[PDB]
From a paper:
The p53 tumor suppressor protein is a central regulator of cell proliferation, DNA repair, differentiation, and death. Structurally, the p53 protein comprises constitutes an intrinsically disordered N-terminal transactivation domain (TAD), a folded core domain or DNA binding domain (DBD), and a C-terminal oligomerization domain (OD). In its folded form, the DBD exhibits a β-sandwich topology with two loops and a loop-sheet-helix motif. The structural zinc(II) ion is coordinated by four amino acid residues, namely C176, H179 (in loop L2) and C238, C242 (in loop L3), ensuring the correct folding of the DBD through the stabilization of these two loops.
Herein, the structure model of the recombinant human mutant p53R280K DBD (without the four stabilizing mutations described in Reference) was obtained by X-ray crystallography for the first time. Crystals grew in space group P21, which contains four molecules in the asymmetric unit and each molecule comprises amino acid residues 97 to 290. The overall fold of the p53R280K structure is similar to structure of the wt p53 DBD in the absence of DNA. As observed in wt p53 and in some mutant p53 forms, in mutant p53R280K, the L2 and L3 loops are stabilized by a zinc(II) ion, which is tetrahedrally-coordinated to C176, H179, C238, and C242. Additionally, at 2.0 Å resolution, it was also possible to confirm the mutation of p53R280K DBD at position 280, as the density for K280 was clear in all four molecules present in the asymmetric unit. This K280 is located at the H2 helix, which belongs to the loop-sheet-helix motif of the DNA binding surface. In the wt DNA-bound p53, the R280 residue is directly involved in DNA recognition, in addition to interacting with a structural water molecule. In the DNA-bound wt p53 structure, the guanidinium group of R280 forms two hydrogen bonds with a guanine nucleotide of consensus DNA, while K280 (in p53R280K) would only be capable of forming one hydrogen bond with DNA. Superposition of both monomer structures clearly shows that the distance between K280 (from p53R280K) and the DNA molecule is longer, a consequence of the shorter side chain of lysine compared to arginine, as also observed in other contact mutants p53R273H and p53R273C. Due to the increased distance and weaker binding, p53R280K is unable to form stabilizing interactions with DNA, which consequently causes its loss of function, despite other well-established contacts that could be maintained.
Residue numbers in the entry: 97 to 289
The structure:
């Protein structure tokens, strides 16, 4: 099981998210109270990278999904049979991968030879000078309710910064639910508190 321990490391690495609210029409919205992203299938999910100092050139940013519940965590998170066979390739992503990056031609996908886990990595780009974070646009390509995939089990996304040889520089994580009405579901889940 890949580690999910938060680690800001030397560059002060944190994640940020847009403060999108819960109107019925939002496509992606983040709950700080739950540390949980609610988003729609194949829609843009912005995730911000914030650092206190700039990691060096050749730094990379990897995203991987794991099941949140200890009893499912050893199982590889992948797309259901249906979505795996759907005609929705962007030509870069492997069809079994849950997490894609959109709008980045340098994107690299990995099937880990030993663990069988999937992940997606992009070069780290600094923020524009006087803009304060780097944004990556993720797409989640199955719903949390897909039969034969996640099947309503909750998942985490783990975001790592790594150097050009794959050494760990920083790690954060957040829970994700991929669903039809992220605003409504966020509001409903927050009602429990
Ligand atoms: Zn699916």
């Amino acid at each position: 099981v890949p580690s999910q321990k938060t680690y800001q490391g030397s560059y002060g690495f944190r994640l940020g998210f847009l403060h999108s609210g819960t109107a019925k029409s939002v496509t992606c919205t983040y709950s700080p109270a739950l540390n949980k992203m609610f988003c729609q299938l194949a829609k843009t999910c912005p995730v911000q990278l914030w650092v206190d100092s700039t990691p060096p050139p050749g730094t990379r940013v990897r995203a991987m999904a794991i099941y949140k519940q200890s009893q499912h965590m050893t199982e590889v998170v992948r797309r259901c049979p249906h979505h795996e066979r759907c005609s929705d390739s962007d030509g870069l992503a492997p069809p079994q991968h849950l997490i894609r990056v959109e709008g980045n031609l340098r994107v690299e996908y990995l099937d880990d030879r030993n663990t069988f886990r999937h992940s997606v990595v992009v070069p780290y780009e600094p923020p524009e000078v006087g803009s304060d974070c780097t944004t990556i646009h993720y797409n989640y390509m199955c719903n949390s309710s897909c039969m034969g995939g996640m099947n309503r089990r909750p998942i985490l996304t783990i975001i790592t910064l790594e150097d050009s040889s794959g050494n760990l520089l920083g790690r954060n994580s957040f829970e994700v639910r991929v669903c039809a009405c992220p605003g409504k579901d966020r509001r409903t889940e927050e009602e429990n508190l």
